[PDB]
């Protein structure tokens, strides 16, 4: 015949049909659609009389002036139907000037159903016996045609007939070609001109009977001008209609391992068939392209688009779903959305490794990078300019990088960058180079000393719990009183509690949103002070809404103001486990201004009423 | 009579009651009156002490940490006006941290002229929700009455008194248990009032003895002269402390006492423009003998020699001392903490400062709105500098919006280097026009004036974008705006479009705040216009809305989003808010 050629997709012009000058079996799908400025005198000299077997489907969607199909595709015999369109293999929808269908030579559409709609000048639809053409007859859909009201005199020629539903009508495609039938002793191989049946392997027409070398549509597999039911070694099956050797399946894997845009389908060898990807629990060995099964968690493998991919929201993160090992750089820029509690841990909670450089540029909604829960290494083969591998700017609420007790990070090369991160403290970016080890291979990194620590504290003291008493439904919590050295500065206390299944809860985890929290924040006013070591000065708070036989987590967090030197104080108790038997940001600032206004006046009043002696 | 007693200077009373006896027949206290720090005092001996003829106190009244005063109506029954020439941390009456005050009792107080009142921190004080302060002193927002025994409605509060309707409720207003205050009909506002509602003479305050008589009034208004009230007293006499008029013999002999400077608090009072003013103002000198003021040869400024090299402007007590001086020989800080609004009084006293010879510093000031109260700043000479070689300086000014209106103002700072940090409502455009008109042009730091932390909470752009075509259907509504290009064709990330519901036309402007909230206008991103290489092209960009309810009004505006750069251009562009209704 000819040579194989991939599938077209043509629209609005006619100049693209020249690429079928030599095609014979177009593997892929041919769909001709949306041609508006085409008069019927443009379709007279156009013919592809050697297109013989197409594999996926056919689609003719609003062409105008296509008078008949009997001069475009006059020698279609078999359509296969591996990939389908709405589970339909031949779609004729909304043409005009379409008088006769006229595909007078197709014999066995293998899988699917034909869908012919709403083409207001089409008859010769009633004389087409779809009982012996497609094997699964009950899903075709032929409504709203010209032949709802029978007006056109579809007389056809001398041609054989059968019965379908009680009516003994004749069978014909056009007014000059009738439907070829073969008697039932030789069911699917198809008959010759006088009524002998063909070889036991062929589909449709055969040129000479009982010779499998020269029929025109092999049913099972094509091999080198002969026809064969199972291709023996050293050959392999490919796209389940033709057979190639090992050399014809290897080289195109390397020839489109680089994408023009997409993709290629990178071919593997697995049990005598070149498949696009191995199934679950199987992975390719890169040496000879063999497919071998798994142990433990299998790589996916997730490569990425052009070296850098930016996450703006959840819809940007959907392409990285389930991705384990990433061969390039990565950048996160999250601002907001809705229901940000557990979704950022859901999309990338099984990530394993990242190999470029990581950018936390312009991210505001995050509180912590603990959602890289399984990440072990940033090795960084490619480097960011400035010899960097870790970059962070515009992090107004970031507070905690990683927990260096339950997790062990490492990295090898590059440098680091932490600038303009106020809430990120300084001792926690001193706590990472024991675990990461950049004091090894010792290098001068560039982190400024004053650019962090603002609206933050790290010299906190340790609060010890004093007395605990559990009832069936209530627990009291009194502890030891903490004072900053200027006791006007302490605004009050902040208590946090949540139920806990085991003894493994970490301190800042899972809330990770803008105005939401997994814990239950509760306030308590400070007590009074009487300059007395023993007095009624121990603070307290009563917790009421409990459940029987539960186990909770509780800790105490102070909240103080700032003297005008960027020198803060504070405290934080340990995480203690106990077992039984809207404050918006604008309200935080204005309530902290009024406490600094009452401190300022009675700081001025002492200053003029006491006068020292000279 | 009008003021039958003796004029009486200011007093401080501490540690005893023996010093209180020198207030026996004083009728007006120019200066202030303080009662401080009395610990060994039982409540039983304040019953036999009373000061009947005290009428008006000019500066302020401070009471702090006394023991045994149950109510003030034993001591001060008849003070009608406290005037407020010299305030005390912008308050004109401050009662701070008494222990046994039960009732306020100042039942005759009518008009606080200048200042505010702050009644703070009393563990027994009742009757504070029954005063109706808005009629007594002429401002109302600057008060501060917190942390009292009337934090709860628990003091009883029985009173047998107009029961005014100034607020929306029918509550009764009374001073004490058995005295109800006087609010009579409001035809004459502050011109005095009798019992039966007849209005007094125009030049009076408080009570009246007989109506329409400028001889037998009690609390006189503009000046005072020989038992009368005269609007402008004639020039056989001159004004003095804006309450008196006094002859030539008085304003001269005070020179002869403190020309021998035994204490540097006295002032040589010199006559100028019918006033007995302490220092004759800028552009004038005193002669040798005759004690007047004459025009100067050339300029002669009043150099305002600031002690210790620094000053810290906190309120109108500290900004009172720089009144009328012109060339500051030091440096000024500005640190205004808390505050409601102080730009109304800072202009009229430190707004005549021409040359300043130090650095400025605007740190931690909350309630500043603009730096415009400095009026005649010409040159910051800057012989000194701050730590780190700076002359101008800012920090943490949470409402600063404008440095100066640059259309008609000139400022030449000779040396030094600028500094800007954490000004969340100040654009870089107002500090870069500052950079070109100042004497400095390219003296910056790297890291210079901070390019990231300025103006984060207020959006501001300069070039405008108009709309060209709006089409409307029952579910979709279509936009089309005329294009825009910066001098760099790559310096464009695209646009961003906003649309929100609004049932009325009083929708706000875009604040620029990002707080993950519902007032973020449901931002829809727009792909950037692809590089057309053509003037008339498909880069007249628009968008289509899809999820609409019919027959409602929407508010739409469009804003670009460019990369900021080290070069001082590409501020962006932003359209104005319009309204479109679907059918």
């Amino acid at each position: 015949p000819g040579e194989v050629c991939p599938g077209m997709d043509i629209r609005n012009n006619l100049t693209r049909l020249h690429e079928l000058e030599n095609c014979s079996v177009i593997e892929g799908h041919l769909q001709i659609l949306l041609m508006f400025k085409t008069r019927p005198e443009d379709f007279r000299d156009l013919s592809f009389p050697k297109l013989i077997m197409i594999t996926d489907y056919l689609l003719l969607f609003r062409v105008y002036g296509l008078e008949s199909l009997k001069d475009l595709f006059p020698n279609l015999t078999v359509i296969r139907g591996s990939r389908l369109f709405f589970n339909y293999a031949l779609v004729i929808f909304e043409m005009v000037h379409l008088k006769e269908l006229g595909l007078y030579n197709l014999m066995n559409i293998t899988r699917g159903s034909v869908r012919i709609e709403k083409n207001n000048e089409l008859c010769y639809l009633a004389t087409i016996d779809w009982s012996r053409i497609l094997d699964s007859v009950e899903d075709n859909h032929i409504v709203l045609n010209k032949d709802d009201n029978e007006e056109c005199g579809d007389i056809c020629p001398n041609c054989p007939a059968t019965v379908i539903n009680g009516q003994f009508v004749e069978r014909c495609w056009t007014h000059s070609h009738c439907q070829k039938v073969c008697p039932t002793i030789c069911k699917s191989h198809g008959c010759t001109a006088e009524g002998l049946c063909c070889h036991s392997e062929c589909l449709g027409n055969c040129s000479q009977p009982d010779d499998p070398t020269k029929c025109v549509a092999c049913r099972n597999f094509y091999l080198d001008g002969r026809c064969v039911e199972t291709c023996p070694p050293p050959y392999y099956h490919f796209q389940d209609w033709r057979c190639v050797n090992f050399s014809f399946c290897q080289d195109l894997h390397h020839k489109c391992k680089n994408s023009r845009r997409q993709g290629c389908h990178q071919y593997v060898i697995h049990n005598n068939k070149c498949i696009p990807e191995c199934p679950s629990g199987y992975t390719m060995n890169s040496s000879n392209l063999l497919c071998t099964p798994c142990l433990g968690p299998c790589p996916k493998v997730c490569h990425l688009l052009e070296g850098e991919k930016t996450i703006d929201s959840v819809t940007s993160a959907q392409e990285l779903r389930g991705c384990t090992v990433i061969n390039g750089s990565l950048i996160i820029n999250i601002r907001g959305g809705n229901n940000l509690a557990a979704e950022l841990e859901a999309n990338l909670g099984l990530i394993e490794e990242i190999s470029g450089y990581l950018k936390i540029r312009r991210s505001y909604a995050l509180v912590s990078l603990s959602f890289f829960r399984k990440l072990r290494l940033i090795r960084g083969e490619t480097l960011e300019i400035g010899n960097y591998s870790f970059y962070a700017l515009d992090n107004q609420n970031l507070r905690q990088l990683w927990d260096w007790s339950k997790h062990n990070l490492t990295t090898t090369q590059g440098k680091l960058f932490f600038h303009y991160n106020p809430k990120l403290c300084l001792s926690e970016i001193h706590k990472m180079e024991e675990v990461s080890g950049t004091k090894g291979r010792q290098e001068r990194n560039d982190i400024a000393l004053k650019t962090n620590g603002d609206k933050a504290s790290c010299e906190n003291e340790l609060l010890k719990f004093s007395y605990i008493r559990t009832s069936f439904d209530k627990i009291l919590l009194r502890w030891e009183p903490y004072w900053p050295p200027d006791f006007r500065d302490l605004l009050g206390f902040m208590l946090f509690y949540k139920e806990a299944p085991y003894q493994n809860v970490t301190e800042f985890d899972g809330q990770d949103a803008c105005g939401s929290n997994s814990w239950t924040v509760v306030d308590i006013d400070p007590p009074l002070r009487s300059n007395d070591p023993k007095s009624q000065n121990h603070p307290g708070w009563l917790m009421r809404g409990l459940k029987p036989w539960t186990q909770y987590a509780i800790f105490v967090k102070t909240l103080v103001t700032f003297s005008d030197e960027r020198r803060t104080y504070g405290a934080k108790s340990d995480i203690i486990y106990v077992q039984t038997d809207p404050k918006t940001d604008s309200q935080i600032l204005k309530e902290l201004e009024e406490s600094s206004f009452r401190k300022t006046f009675e700081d001025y009043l002492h200053n003029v009423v006491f006068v020292p002696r000279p | 009579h009008l003021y039958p007693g003796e004029v009486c200077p200011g007093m401080d009373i501490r540690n005893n009651l023996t010093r209180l006896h020198e207030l026996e027949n004083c009728s007006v206290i120019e200066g202030h009156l303080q009662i401080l720090l009395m610990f060994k005092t039982r409540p039983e001996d304040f019953r036999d002490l009373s000061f009947p003829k005290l009428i008006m106190i000019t500066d302020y009244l401070l009471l702090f940490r006394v023991y045994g005063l149950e109510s003030l109506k034993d001591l001060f029954p008849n003070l009608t006006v406290i005037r407020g020439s010299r305030l005390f941390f912008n308050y004109a009456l401050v009662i701070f941290e008494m222990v046994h005050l039960k009732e306020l009792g100042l039942y005759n107080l009518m008009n606080i002229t200048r200042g505010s009142v702050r009644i703070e921190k009393n563990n027994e004080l009742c009757y504070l929700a029954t005063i109706d302060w808005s009629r007594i002193l002429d401002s109302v927002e600057d008060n501060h009455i917190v942390l009292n025994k009337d934090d709860n409605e628990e003091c009883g509060d029985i009173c047998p008194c107009p029961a005014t309707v100034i607020n929306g409720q029918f509550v009764e207003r009374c001073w004490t248990h058995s005295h109800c205050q006087k609010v009579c009909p409001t035809i004459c506002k502050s011109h005095g009032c009798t019992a039966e509602g007849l209005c007094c003479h125009s030049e009076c305050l408080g009570n009246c003895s007989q109506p329409d008589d400028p001889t037998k009034c009690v609390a006189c208004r503009n000046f005072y002269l020989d038992g009368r009230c005269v609007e402008t007293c004639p020039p056989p006499y001159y004004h003095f402390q804006d309450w008196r008029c006094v002859n030539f013999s008085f304003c001269q002999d005070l020179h002869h006492k403190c020309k021998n400077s035994r204490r540097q608090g006295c002032h040589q009072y010199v006559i100028h423009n019918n006033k007995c003013i302490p220092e004759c103002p800028s552009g004038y000198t005193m002669n040798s003998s005759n004690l007047l003021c004459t025009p100067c040869l050339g300029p002669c400024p009043k150099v305002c020699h600031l002690l210790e090299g620094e000053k810290t402007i906190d309120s109108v007590t500290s900004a009172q001392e720089l009144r009328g001086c012109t060339v500051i020989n030091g440096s000024l800080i500005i640190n205004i903490r808390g505050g409601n609004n102080l730009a109304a009084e800072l202009e009229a006293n430190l707004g005549l400062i021409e040359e300043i010879s130090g650095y400025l510093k605007i740190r931690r000031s909350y309630a500043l709105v603009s730096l415009s109260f400095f009026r005649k700043l010409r040159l910051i000479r800057g012989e000194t500098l701050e730590i780190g070689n700076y002359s101008f300086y800012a920090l943490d000014n949470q409402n600063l919006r404008q440095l100066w209106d640059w259309s008609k103002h000139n400022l030449t700072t000779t040396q030094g280097k600028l500094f800007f940090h954490y000004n969340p409502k100040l654009c870089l455009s107002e500090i870069h026009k500052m950079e070109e008109v100042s004497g400095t042009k390219g003296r910056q730091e790297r890291n210079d004036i901070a390019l990231k932390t300025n103006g984060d909470k207020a959006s501001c752009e300069n070039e405008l974008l108009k709309f060209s075509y709006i089409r409307t259907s029952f579910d979709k509504i279509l936009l089309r705006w005329e294009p825009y290009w910066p001098p760099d064709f790559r310096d464009l990330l695209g646009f961003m479009l906003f649309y929100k519901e609004a049932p009325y036309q009083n929708v706000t402007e875009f604040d620029g705040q990002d707080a993950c909230g519902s007032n973020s206008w449901t931002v829809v991103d727009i792909d950037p216009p692809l590089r057309s290489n053509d003037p008339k092209s498909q880069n007249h960009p628009g968008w289509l809305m899809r999820g609409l309810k019919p027959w409602t009004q929407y508010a739409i505006f469009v804003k670009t989003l460019v990369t900021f750069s080290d070069e001082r251009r590409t501020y962006g562009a932003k359209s104005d808010i319009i309204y479109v209704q679907t059918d």
């Binding site: 200027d486 006791f487 006007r488 300059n531 006491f610 | 501490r14 540690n15 720090l37």
Partner: peptide, 25 residues
């Protein structure tokens, strides 16, 4: 505590000055 500022300053200074009295110019 020997860090005497705040409201304790006006009380702690009284007991060391219980009879002499405070001083002013």
């Amino acid at each position: 505590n020997q860090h005497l500022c705040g409201s304790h300053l006006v009380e702690a200074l009284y007991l060391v000055c219980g009879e002499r009295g405070f001083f002013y110019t």
